[PDB]
């Protein structure tokens, strides 16, 4: 289904029994690796659809969750 | 950084100039220039519009916008 990043995040959280704090912990090595930081408040905003993550943060969460960037953006594509 | 080689190919093929692409995206050319030259990150909506404008296959998006150099 063609959606947005906000729903894909919620999809991951429900499918993989993860909360926002889990995702942050997983992103920590990738934050250092890519030089892209992500705070709890800013991730909360992505989930609550307050702001849409840019290219950098999409890349960060994709590599962190091990999924396709296109899928994470809401495109009707394979998850990996 | 991001390798936009493939992306630059489609832009030349579909739009011609970077300026033409800018107009099609509804952006200034300086804005487009800074993004294609990896000085400014791509916004969420800009990537989606680029897919519409360049008629890219959505599954190819990781190779167009998320290819690290």
- Rg of chain B over CA atoms, rounded to whole Å, is 11 Å
Strand residue content of chain A: under 5%
Q: Do you know the CATH architecture of chain B?
A: Orthogonal Bundle
Cα end-to-end separation of chain A: 15 Å
Total of domains of chain B: 1
Helix and strand run of chain A? HHHHH
Question: Helix amount of chain B, in percent?
Answer: 55-70%
The coarse silhouette of chain B is: globular
Report the end-to-end length of chain B measured between terminal Cα atoms: 6 Å
Largest interface: A-B, 17 and 14 residues
Q: Please give the share of residues in helix of chain A.
A: 55-70%
Tell me which oligomeric state these chains represent.
heterodimer
PDB class: viral protein
Keywords: temperate virus, viral protein
Assembly: dimeric
Entry title: CI-MOR repressor-antirepressor complex of the temperate bacteriophage TP901-1 from Lactococcus lactis
What would a concise description of this structure say?
The complex is a heterodimer of chains A (about 80) and B (about 70). Chain A is mostly helical. In chain A, about 60% of the residues lie in helices and about 0% in strands.
Looking at this protein, list some descriptive labels.
A: 80 residues, mainly alpha, globular, B: 69 residues, 434 Repressor (Amino-terminal Domain), MOR (chain B), DUF739 (chain B), CI (chain A)
């Amino acid at each position: 289904m063609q959606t947005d990043t906000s729903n894909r995040l919620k999809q991951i959280m429900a499918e993989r029994n993860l909360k926002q704090v889990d995702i942050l912990n997983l992103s920590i090595p990738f934050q250092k690796k890519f030089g892209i930081k992500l705070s709890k408040s800013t991730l909360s905003q992505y989930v609550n659809s307050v702001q849409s993550p840019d290219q950098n943060r999409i890349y960060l969460l994709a590599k962190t969750l091990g999924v396709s960037e296109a899928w994470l953006m809401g495109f009707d594509v394979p998850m990996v | 950084s991001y390798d936009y080689s493939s992306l630059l190919g489609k832009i030349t093929e579909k739009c011609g100039t970077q300026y033409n692409f800018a107009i099609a995206m509804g952006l200034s050319e300086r804005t487009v220039s800074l993004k294609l030259n990896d000085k400014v990150t791509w916004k969420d909506d800009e990537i989606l519009k680029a897919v519409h404008v360049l008629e890219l296959n959505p599954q190819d998006i990781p190779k167009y916008f998320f290819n690290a150099k």
